[PDB]
């Protein structure tokens, strides 16, 4: 739930391990 992945996901997918797309920002927990 936290935007601490240093990654955006405009296209809908995140590449950082443990991160998922809270569109359009990658989040972890």
Distance between the termini: 4 Å
Q: What does the main sheet amount to?
A: 2 strands, antiparallel
Approximately what portion of the residues adopt beta-strand conformation? Answer: 15-25%
For the secondary structure, the number of strands is 2
Radius of gyration over C-alpha positions, nearest whole angstrom: 7 Å
Number of domains: 1
Neighbour order of strands in the largest sheet:
1-2
Question: In oligomeric terms, what are we looking at?
Answer: monomer
Helix content: under 10%
Based on helices, strands and strand pairing, what is the structural class?
mainly beta
Question: Based on CA inertia axes, which overall geometry fits?
Answer: globular
Helix-strand pattern, N to C? EE
**Helical stretch count?**
0
Protein name: Kalata-B1
GO biological process, one term: defense response to bacterium
Keywords: Antibiotic, Antimicrobial, Cytolysis, Disulfide bond, Hemolysis, Knottin, Pharmaceutical, Plant defense, Signal
Family: Belongs to the cyclotide family. Moebius subfamily.
Give me the secondary-structure topology:
Elements: E1 20-22, E2 25-27
Antiparallel strand pairs: 1-2
Explained architecture:
There is a cross-link at residues 1-29 (Cyclopeptide (Gly-Asn)). This is Kalata-B1. Keywords: Antibiotic, Antimicrobial, Cytolysis, Disulfide bond, Hemolysis, Knottin, Pharmaceutical, Plant defense, Signal. Belongs to the cyclotide family. Moebius subfamily. One of its GO terms (biological process) is killing of cells of another organism. The structure is a monomer. With 29 residues, the chain is an all-beta fold. It has one domain (1-29). It is 0% helix and 21% strand. The protein has no helices and two strands. It has strands spanning 20-22, 25-27. It has a two-stranded antiparallel ribbon with strand order 1-2. The radius of gyration is 7 Å and the shape is globular.
């Amino acid at each position: 739930g936290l935007p601490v992945c240093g990654e955006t996901c405009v296209g809908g997918t995140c590449n950082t391990p443990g991160c998922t797309c809270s569109w359009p920002v990658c989040t972890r927990n």
